Structure formats: C-alpha cells, structure tokens
C-alpha cells in the first residue's frame, strides 16, 4: 500500500484540456465551458466515473498523458496515425477540417497562395502539420502555445494567415465581426479530421468511455449538446466512418 491510501477513497479521473479553443473549451467567468466540457460531463456520468477537469494547456496535456499524471484528455483533439503510436483514442465524436483564417483584405484564395507568407499555428497541432505539408517545415510557420495567441498575431499583422480548425475559426468570426476576419476553406488541400478523447497507451478507461459515448449518442444527449453549441442538427453518420 506504500505510496497510496490502500483504497480509503476512490480517486477521481484526472482529465486535462487546453481551454483556449472556443466553442470546444474556453474560460468564462473563471469556469471551463464549451462543447467538449458538456460532452465530457455527460460521458463520464454515463460511465459512472467521478472526474476533475483541469485547464493544463496544450503541450503540458500531451506531456502529462505520456507520464500518466493525467488519465484522459478532451481538447478538440484530432485522431492521427502518429498520435496513435503514443496514445489511445476513443471512438470519434466530431468531424472537422483545417481552414485558413485571414483578414478581410487578404489576397489569399487557397492554400497555395500562402507561398512566401508567414503562417501562424498552435504548436504540435494538425494545423501546424497541414502548414508544413504545403511548402515544407521552416521558420515561415510561427508556432504558439495557444490558438488564441495565433489569432492575436493575425490581428496585429505578426502573421499573414492562421491555419486552425473550422469550427474554431467560424466561431471566432461569428463572435468578432468588428475584427473583419474571414475563413478561406480549401477542401482539395485539407483532409477530413475526426476528434477523439485521448488516453495514455493501454488505458483501462478507453472501453468505459467508448460505451458511455455510445450511451450519450443513443439517448439523444449528444445531439442536445450539439444543438446548444452549433444551432443545427448533427449528422450522426459522420461518427461511423
């Protein structure tokens, strides 16, 4: 029993996030809110698992999954083959794509127009990878610890464009008409992406979360949550690809 409490209290599942990614997770009057926050609460409750959500940030979240200090993550995280080498994922719960966020005056009409330009991304994201895919890795791509800061460098002209997830870019534009930004989609260039909850490799929580996610989808709770954040019916068939 050394190092533990010999079972005196069942410990809570430690869930990490980077709450700087509206509408999925963000801070509002000192609380973490968003689509992921709601979906997590429904999932863990269906699983019967007491939990704590921590706003630990993006790069720390991955480091902490590796060490198993954090048991689980939800953070608008794309399921990728490279990530699967290090972590496990739940079944998918959302579909997304990368998009190009620019100022309304921008001449950018597609990804190839970014040649010779500076691109802001959040570090170690699928947006960074998509940016690197275009013309290769290099210092022309500026990497920030939050998507928030990437967008701030767009606003002040530090970068020419940001590559980030479509619902985040769309939500930012909707909430900030005064900033006169626009979203440029390039479906021939960018791939379909699916979000999953993330776990350390070999996690006992995965199977429980997959079952609870199905429970939440099947009961109609998923679509209530989706309607709350996105104002339209989900196409649930996107979750069976």
Residues that bind ligand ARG (CB under 6 A): 18, 21, 25, 58, 75-78, 122, 125-126, 147, 165
Cβ neighbours of residue 172 under 8 Å, at least 6 residues apart?
22, 101, 151, 179, 181
CA distances from 59 to 8, 31, 146, 181 (A): 33, 21, 9, 27
CB of 76 to ligand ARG, least distance (A): 4
CA distance linking residue 42 with residue 93, whole number of Å = 13
CB of 126 to ligand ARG, least distance (A): 4
Q: Which is nearer to ligand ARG, 146 or 203 (CB)?
A: 146
CB of 62 to ligand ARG, least distance (A): 10
CB of 161 to ligand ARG, least distance (A): 16
Q: Which is nearer to ligand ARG, 24 or 226 (CB)?
A: 24
CB of 224 to ligand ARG, least distance (A): 22
CA distance linking residue 41 with residue 49, whole number of Å = 10
Q: Are 49 and 64 in contact (CB under 8 A)?
A: no
Write the DSSP symbol of residue 223. Answer: H
Q: Position of tokens 């698992």?
A: 49
Q: Which is nearer to ligand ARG, 51 or 58 (CB)?
A: 58
55: which 2 tokens?
């706003």
Q: Which is nearer to ligand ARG, 160 or 193 (CB)?
A: 193
Q: Which is nearer to ligand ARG, 64 or 126 (CB)?
A: 126
Radius of gyration from C-alpha coordinates of the chain? 19
CA distance linking residue 116 with residue 154, whole number of Å = 16
CA distances from 163 to 67, 75, 140, 209 (A): 29, 17, 13, 30
Q: Which is nearer to ligand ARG, 80 or 215 (CB)?
A: 80
CB of 6 to ligand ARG, least distance (A): 36
């Amino acid at each position: 029993s050394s190092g533990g409490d010999g079972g005196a209290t069942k410990k809570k599942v430690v869930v990490g996030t980077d709450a700087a990614f509206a509408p999925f997770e963000y801070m509002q009057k000192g609380k973490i809110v968003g689509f992921d926050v709601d979906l997590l609460d429904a999932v863990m409750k269906a699983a019967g698992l007491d939990y704590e959500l921590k706003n630990i940030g993006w790069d720390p979240l991955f480091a902490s999954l590796q060490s198993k200090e954090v048991d689980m993550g939800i953070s608008g995280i794309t399921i990728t083959d490279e990530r699967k080498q290090s972590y496990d994922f739940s079944d998918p719960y959302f579909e997304a794509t990368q998009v190009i966020l620019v100022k309304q005056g921008s001449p950018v009409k597609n990804a190839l127009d970014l040649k010779g330009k500076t691109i802001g991304v959040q570090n170690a994201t699928t947006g960074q990878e998509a940016a690197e895919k275009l013309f290769g890795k290099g210092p022309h791509i500026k990497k920030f610890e939050t998507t928030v800061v990437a967008i701030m460098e767009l606003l002040n002209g530090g970068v020419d464009a940001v590559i980030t997830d479509n619902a985040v870019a769309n939500e930012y534009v909707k909430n900030n008409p005064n900033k006169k930004l626009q979203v440029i989609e390039d479906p021939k260039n960018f791939a379909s992406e699916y979000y999953g909850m993330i776990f350390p490799k070999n996690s006992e929580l995965k199977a429980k979360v997959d079952e609870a996610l199905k429970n939440v989808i099947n009961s109609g709770k998923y679509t209530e949550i989706y309607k709350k954040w996105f104002g339209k019916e989900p196409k649930l068939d996107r979750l069976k690809q």
